[PDB]
């Protein structure tokens, strides 16, 4: 076992799991889900004594809410069995335990509803509504909604009740930023886009509205059920180990077409 030395002792035997997922979405103008997947990693940070037999249990459905892995690679320390149990003697400190992909039953934490109105050929009226879709006790953090503007843009007027927004002319986008937002809510932004005149013939190819966010759950639906520690020499049971998990779900590509 060349990934863990043999001397290791801690009074405080503790581990931390980070489930880190990036959720990706392409949505049609009329709310259809054109494409969506999650990529995830589980990172373990183990401060455990001796050489212990860890067993990682999740809400895998092949084994309540239960979920569907398309595929995954593991860290060499993992004993490949097909009971679908995850067994290993972990390296010390921090390492990547598994990497995975999911396409089915994904929680899309945000819904984006765009509305666009042409006003002659002098301006565009734009309304965008975002809906948080997740437990109300949970807050999303670091929410950005990026609304692209045409190249013939004289100037931009925006109102929003939540957040701050700026027209960023060099980037050709309005950028709305919200610090915090809770589950099962709505917010909207209105903007009026002043146009320059332009070659009437070439039309605007409206790129998507994209979002960034971070959420404290796994959009795949993954929940950690247990992490079991057995060290058969040393005199500490499983229930002596202090165990922690956190979830950090972040947008990848998360685009809604208008």
């Amino acid at each position: 076992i060349g990934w863990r030395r043999e001397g290791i002792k801690y009074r405080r035997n503790e581990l931390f799991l980070d489930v880190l997922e990036s959720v990706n979405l392409l949505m049609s103008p009329q709310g259809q889900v054109l494409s969506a997947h999650v990529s995830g990693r589980v990172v373990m940070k183990s401060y455990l004594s001796g050489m212990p037999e860890c067993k990682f249990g999740m809400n895998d459905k092949i084994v309540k809410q239960s979920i569907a892995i398309d595929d995954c690679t593991f860290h060499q320390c993992v004993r490949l069995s097909k009971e679908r149990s995850i067994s290993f003697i972990p390296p010390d400190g921090e390492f990547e335990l598994m990497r995975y992909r999911t396409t089915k039953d994904i929680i899309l934490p945000f819904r984006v509803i765009p509305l666009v109105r042409e006003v002659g050929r002098t301006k565009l009226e734009v309304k965008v509504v975002i809906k948080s879709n997740f437990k109300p006790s949970l807050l999303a953090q670091k929410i950005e909604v990026r609304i692209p503007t045409p190249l013939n843009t004289s100037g931009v007027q925006v109102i929003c009740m939540k957040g701050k927004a700026k027209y960023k002319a060099s980037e050709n986008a309005i950028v709305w930023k919200i610090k915090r937002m809770a589950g099962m809510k709505e917010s909207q932004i209105s903007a009026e886009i002043e146009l320059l005149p332009t070659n009437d013939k070439k039309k605007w190819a409206r790129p998507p509205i994209s979002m960034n966010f971070e959420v404290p759950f796994a959009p795949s639906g993954l929940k950690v059920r247990y992490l079991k520690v057995f060290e058969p020499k040393l005199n500490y049971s499983d229930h002596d180990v202090i165990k922690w998990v956190r979830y950090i779900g972040r947008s990848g590509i998360y685009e809604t077409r208008c």
Binding site: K243, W244, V245
Partner: peptide, 6 residues
């Protein structure tokens, strides 16, 4: 943000 595994 870290919670106990129950």
């Amino acid at each position: 943000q870290y919670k106990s595994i129950l």
